[PDB]
Amino acid sequence: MVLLAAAVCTKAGKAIVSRQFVEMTRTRIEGLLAAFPKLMNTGKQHTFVETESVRYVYQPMEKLYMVLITTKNSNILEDLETLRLFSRVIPEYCRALEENEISEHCFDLIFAFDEIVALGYRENVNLAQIRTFTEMDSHEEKVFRAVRETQEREAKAEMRRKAKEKEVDNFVDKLKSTKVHAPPINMESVHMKIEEKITLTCGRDGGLQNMELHGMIMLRISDDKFGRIRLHVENEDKKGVQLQTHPNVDKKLFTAESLIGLKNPEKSFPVNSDVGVLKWRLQTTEESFIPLTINCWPSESGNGCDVNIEYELQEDNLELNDVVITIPLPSGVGAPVIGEIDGEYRHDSRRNTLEWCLPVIDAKNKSGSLEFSIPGQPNDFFPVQVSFISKKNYCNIQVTKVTQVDGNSPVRFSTETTFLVDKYEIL
Amino acid sequence: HSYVRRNAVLAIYTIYRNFEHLIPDAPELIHDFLVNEKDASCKRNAFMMLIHADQDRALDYLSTCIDQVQTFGDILQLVIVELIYKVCHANPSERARFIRCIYNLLQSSSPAVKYEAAGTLVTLSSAPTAIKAAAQCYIDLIIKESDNNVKLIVLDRLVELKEHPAHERVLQDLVMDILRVLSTPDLEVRKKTLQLALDLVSSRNVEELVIVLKKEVIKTNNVSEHEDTDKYRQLLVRTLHSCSVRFPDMAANVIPVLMEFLSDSNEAAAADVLEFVREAIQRFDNLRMLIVEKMLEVFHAIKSVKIYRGALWILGEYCSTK
């Protein structure tokens, strides 16, 4: 809609005809409107008045006004066209002008509103053509002759049977204008950031719908002195992760040696620019791969479901910090009641969530459980979201040492390793 | 037939409130349907409903469409502009993908498009750069503009806008240009301007203006057959009056005095008088004396009740040249 009514008006204090797109009220909306319109508010001239954020849109056409109404913003011209357009249409539609003619062709006229405008949308052009669409058609006829005829034959026969039976940018720039160790001060001239992200979806049943692991080693060198070096990579990983080396890096060297170096040893790595020397990917359905399994078992005690959720750390290698298991809760029910729990929790009334936090999850302490009760259904509890950060990488891949290409002397280096969760959800 | 199909879009819309559920699988179904589809008319519709069912699908598609848009017909384009708006106030983080497009949208060219295009922008942004971008659009627009009713409207927005009290220098300044257009009259519009105009001046961008005012003034002389502009004059003077209060003002002013002498109706005298009062308060004086001289001429140079009255006060006032 962009108009709840179109009413065509005559001077009379009264609008000659109208149609109500939507009914609810009574005319008093329309009735009141009519009254106001008739009154004109004595106001002198002006073909538009909007007051109180209501457009009263009109056009005198003579002693007649054609009127549209709206309240929130519009593009004018279009509008005008319409008022005017009305002023083109009528002598065709209902015949000329005098109420009566219209009185006879009311049906035609209303039909025209609808036809013309489908809810504040300028539907077409061409009046005659507009006739065309209905009560003027074509298809029906085509069908009828053949059909009617066919039947007729059957009938005829029957009678017998019966009978007998750059730019962007300029703008953009202008406009544009846990912590890791940020300054170059706290980093060696050779620095690597090893970051991995995990995307995992699991069914509540515990099956693994999808697991994706992406990781990369970003190398940054602050001093050209360090430009020609080789990285020693230690790979403990059993998972079957696929590794890819940067296009500049010697693939064979990496494969046999497990050293990362440029294809041309004479070449130097870029200085003060990050280079993703190595990347790896793991995508797998195998549940065995899940780092931290979550088992949530809602059960409905009579009136008042009890939820028991536990986690267990599969990979002994990991040490997970700031683990938060976010559990959605039903609303309007009040706060959840907490029973035995390992760790602590935070209840958010607005969010309607129960965040279960910690304990630190180590190889030593693989599992923990939470029990609480709230009135609700098992579905209310999902999806469960898991968030955590790990200092150690999921993939057992590390850079043990860095050496100079010439002389192979050891070089000091620093590393920042993070394992982050893009999405870890239990359906 | 697209007519038939389109009709379903309304119908469905009708369901969605009444018994949405009646059909439950729809929002996607539509969305796939869109894929099958290619009639703009129907598409336009499709969008309108689709976002109401769920924005997300539209968005996915939006991502897709981003380059293509430019090629396309407006009406459908419009509908997205509304949608995007509501969500950020609730939450953002989304930009780039949009931006990429948005810049393309900073072609902008239909009067509708432009009308919205600057309007949406402000909604989105208000950076000084932003302030400028939109501003331009208006100014040209206006200039191009013809339906006065329209003109006023943007002002109103503008009127709102001022509460961009970070209120840049320039912008105030661009007014004159715009103002020039006023000479193609319509007082009522003009009038709205004057009020509007007054505001910006920290007793500055002033002179250039003043001068301009004087230009106006000449212009005002002209040959005139004032009927509408007269009104303006009075107003102007008000507008003008205010400034002065603040300001230290100058020769320009002298000229009014002169100007006033020319004239022949009471309302001005009243102003003048108003000035009489005021000035009586204001007294740094110097000017007055000249003016008093000026006046002396004016006076010698003239007769009338008004004058007659004038004399009285002035007489009342008195000082030297014993």
PDB file of N, CA and C in Angstrom, chain A residues 75 168, chain B residues 103 112:
ATOM      1  N   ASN A  75       8.015  10.368  -3.252  1.00  0.00           N
ATOM      2  CA  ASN A  75       8.709  11.073  -4.306  1.00  0.00           C
ATOM      3  C   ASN A  75       7.603  11.690  -5.062  1.00  0.00           C
ATOM      4  N   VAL A 168      35.536   6.065  -5.348  1.00  0.00           N
ATOM      5  CA  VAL A 168      34.876   5.462  -4.228  1.00  0.00           C
ATOM      6  C   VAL A 168      35.643   5.639  -3.033  1.00  0.00           C
TER       7      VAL A 168
ATOM      8  N   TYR B 103      28.718   2.810  -2.969  1.00  0.00           N
ATOM      9  CA  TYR B 103      29.465   3.725  -3.716  1.00  0.00           C
ATOM     10  C   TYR B 103      28.909   3.787  -5.087  1.00  0.00           C
ATOM     11  N   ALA B 112      13.619  10.553  -8.257  1.00  0.00           N
ATOM     12  CA  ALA B 112      13.328   9.724  -7.168  1.00  0.00           C
ATOM     13  C   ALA B 112      14.539   9.195  -6.564  1.00  0.00           C
TER      14      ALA B 112
END
